[PDB]
Every structure is written in C-alpha cells, then in structure tokens.
C-alpha cells in the first residue's frame with residue numbers, strides 16, 4: 001500500500017469526502033495508463049492526478065503543436081515543440097509530487113502492445129485516434145481481461161451533455177467507433193456476442209456530428225468531457241470491484 | 246473588429262472547423278466575464294481561452310490553496326499562495342497571447358455588482374459559491390438583460406453525465422439552486438413568471454447528493470464549467486444568427 005502522507009490528505013481531502021476513505025487508499029494504490037495524451041487523454045491524465053491516483057503511465061510520442069491549443073491542456077506557448085507525455089508528466093508532478101508518473105515516449109503498435117500492457121495496470125484509458133493501433137490495444141486488453149475504457153471520436157461535437165458510456169458495439173454518430181469495429185473483426189476476429197456486445201466500454205455521444213465548417217473540428221468543452229467521463233467510469237468500476245471482493 | 250492574426254488562426258483552426266468562420270470572429274470580438282475562479286470557474290476560464298474568446302475578465306480575491314488540488318486547474322505546487330485570478334490570467338496569456346485578460350482582484354457584493362457587471366460583457370458565467378452575492382449578481386444581470394449563465398451546486402456529485410441546463414426555477418436535487426430562488430424572491434422580488442420560469446439559465450445536475458463540506462471531483466466540477474461555456478456560446482451564436 002502507498003502511504004498517504006499528511007500533504008496527500010491536504011490535497012485530496014475533498015476526494016476522501018466524496019468517495020470515502022477506503023476509496024482514497026484504493027486510488028493511491030492504483031496504477032492507471034493513459035494511451036494518447038491529446039484532446040481526450042490529456043484531460044483524462046489531469047483528472048486522474050487530481051483525484052489522488054497514485055501512479056500514472058502516459059504513452060504518446062507526439063509533440064505539442066500550436067494547433068493543439070483548442071483542445072489539449074498541455075498546449076501553451078512555452079510547451080510548443082516538446083513531447084506531450086513529458087510535458088503532462090511534469091504538470092502531474094506539480095499537482096501531486098508524490099504521484100509516481102511513468103513516461104513511455106512511444107506509440108502503441110500491434111508489435112509492442114503486449115510489453116507495454118504487461119505491467120499490470122488497474123485500468124487502461126485508451127484515447128488514441130488511429131484505428132489500427134486502437135483496435136490492437138482493445139483486442140489485447142479484452143483477451144487478457146485488462147480493465148479498459150475507450151473513446152469514440154470527440155471531434156465534430158459541441159454538446160457535452162450528450163456524452164455517455166455504452167458497449168462499443170452500440171455507438172452512434174461516431175465514424176471512428178465504426179471503423180474500429182470493422183478492424184477488430186477483420187484483424188483480430190473480435191465480433192459481437194449473441195447479446196450484440198463486444199464486451200468493451202466506450203465513451204461516445206448521441207450528438208449529431210457537425211461537419212467541417214470554413215477534418216472535423218473540436219472543442220475543449222467536449223473533448224475534455226470525454227476524458228472526464230472515461231475517468232469517472234473507470235473509478236466507478238474499480239470501486240465496484242473492490243466492494244465485490 | 247479584432248483582426249484575427251495568422252498566429253490566432255493556427256491556434257484556433259479547430260475552433261473554426263467546428264463553429265465556422267463567422268463564429269470564430271464573433272468569439273474574437275466577445276468579452277466574457279467569469280465570476281469565481283474555483284472548481285467550476287477555473288475550467289470555464291480555460292475553455293473560454295481555448296475556444297478563441299478574445300477578451301476575458303476574471304473576478305476573484307482568493308488565493309490558490311493546497312485543498313484546491315482536487316478540483317481547480319490553477320492548483321499546482323508553485324502556485325500555492327498566489328491570487329487565483331492572476332494565476333489563471335497568466336495561464337490564459339500562455340494559451341492565447343493575443344487574448345485581452347482583465348483581473349478584478351475583488352469579490353462581487355450586493356453593493357458593487359452594478360459597477361462591475363455593467364462594463365458591457367457579451368456574457369457572464371457566474372461560478373460563485375456564496376448565496377447572497379450570487380442572488381445579487383443573478384438579480385442584477387436578469388433585471389439588466391445581461392446574458393448570464395449560472396451554476397448550481399457541483400460538490401457531493403460523482404456523475405458528470407447528469408449535468409444539464411435548465412431554467413433556475415426547474416432545477417431538482419440542488420439545494421444551492423433552491424436557496425437561490427428563495428433568496429431571489431425574498432430580497433429582490435424575483436419570482437416565477439407565467440410559464441413557470443425565472444428567466445435565468447442554470448447548470449445543475451440531477452444526481453442525488455453524496456454526504457460525507459461536500460467533497461468534489463474535477464470530472465464533475467469542470468464539466469459544470471464546460472457545460473456553462475458551451476451553453477453561452479450556443480446562445481451567442483443563435484443571437485448572431487438572428488442578426
């Protein structure tokens with residue numbers, strides 16, 4: 001068990017009062033991986049750190065670009081050109097200097113997924129946009145019963161009150177999730193069971209897509225909320241599993 | 246009237262692709278006030294900045310405290326003891342150096358609300374927690390037809406998906422909103438109309454409250470702020486539309 005220090009309780013006393021003391025230790029002992037530190041994942045990383053999660057792995061090899069500014073928490077003038085994962089790690093150490101943060105400066109691929117998932121995470125939050133690796137990550141977590149939550153496309157959306165969680169097989173107005181389902185079947189033989197489910201939790205929105213005005217655009221209000229609903233769903237699952245034990 | 250630089254178009258290309266060029270220009274010309282830079286308002290200030298809003302005022306007098314860490318974007322070790330509004334202003338300038346950020350290092354009170362509120366804001370986001378000033382700010386904006394969105398209670402809640410916007414008269418499960426309508430009536434004679442509405446937009450959640458000083462979580466308090474900002478932008482855009 002990670003030891004909760006007096007400074008930890010000052011930082012996260014509001015966490016303890018919301019979720020209880022048992023959950024505070026559960027979160028301090030957790031190890032959560034965020035794959036893709038972008039429009040969804042950067043805000044997922046922020047939320048985990050601010051809810052007293054004791055260890056966080058960040059996996060991404062992209063750098064902060066000026067064009068990230070609309071929707072990524074790490075996109076500031078002074079960060080531009082630095083590695084997203086490294087920049088987010090430094091911000092997490094500012095939120096909670098006792099959080100153990102690991103940076104994997106790499107992309108997940110069908111060939112390295114086993115080694116990066118081999119670590120035994122409490123939860124994986126998949127926030128990547130490229131469909132091939134996303135399918136491979138999902139296929140691997142599902143087969144190995146690794147707790148995972150994924151996200152459909154967060155672009156082309158303006159209403160954060162329509163964001164919610166469903167089985168991946170049952171999303172709508174999400175072309176990314178549809179391509180994902182195709183690739184899961186075609187490359188990994190992962191298909192719907194009899195009850196019509198893939199057994200994979202997906203954050204999506206019922207909102208009708210807003211097509212490019214002036215690729216799809218995006219807004220913090222929506223993309224960040226994707227990440228926050230992914231974190232809330234993961235924490236809730238973790239707590240349910242602990243109580244069940 | 247703000248001339249959108251190319252640097253601005255590089256920052257907010259994605260904004261333009263989502264809301265359109267006309268909206269982008271409307272946001273660059275807007276001036277939005279955020280009152281209370283806490284678990285709700287700090288994320289609202291952030292969303293405002295990252296959506297290309299061209300002028301932002303922040304009103305708060307409190308300092309960043311370690312206990313803020315669970316739910317406020319400016320709560321970081323090196324910021325502790327600095328004025329929240331100034332820390333947030335500095336961050337906004339790092340998001341968009343061309344943004345015009347004004348810090349009011351004061352609390353809104355029933356005696357200074359007209360002086361601060363009547364600067365001609367495009368929109369006011371009220372994210373204050375104290376009931377009496379909050380009633381006063383709502384009553385003033387509503388009497389003066391200042392576009393306002395207010396936020397109810399964000400603490401004691403774990404489910405960001407239950408957050409919504411409705412007329413302040415129709416909120417449920419929110420004691421802060423209930424106390425506000427009471428105070429509005431008693432101290433300002435602000436009361437429901439014919440249609441049952443008070444004519445005030447309120448961000449609230451239908452979730453039943455979790456009693457341990459409620460706790461709070463970023464995933465919820467931030468989403469209150471994000472939903473306030475999306476609502477304000479929708480209303481401004483709809484008003485622009487209808488020329």
Ligand SMILES: Nc1ncnc2c1ncn2[C@@H]1O[C@H](COP(=O)(O)O)[C@@H](O)[C@H]1O
Pocket residue numbers: 035036037038039040041059060061062084106107108109127128129130133134
């Ligand atoms: N295979 C991958 N592994 C890890 N991160 C990825 C991978 N593919 C894409 N990403 C990242 O996922 C993030 C997607 O965010 P966005 O551009 O905001 O949708 C970006 O930061 C990408 O660099």
Ligand SMILES: Nc1ncnc2c1ncn2[C@@H]1O[C@H](COP(=O)(O)O)[C@@H](O)[C@H]1O
Pocket residue numbers: 280281282283284285304305306307316329351352353354372373374375378379
């Ligand atoms: N009358 C007021 N005028 C402006 N800001 C206020 C007022 N009362 C409270 N606040 C701020 O509202 C914020 C509430 O945040 P929280 O404590 O997270 O609800 C804090 O940063 C307070 O300092």
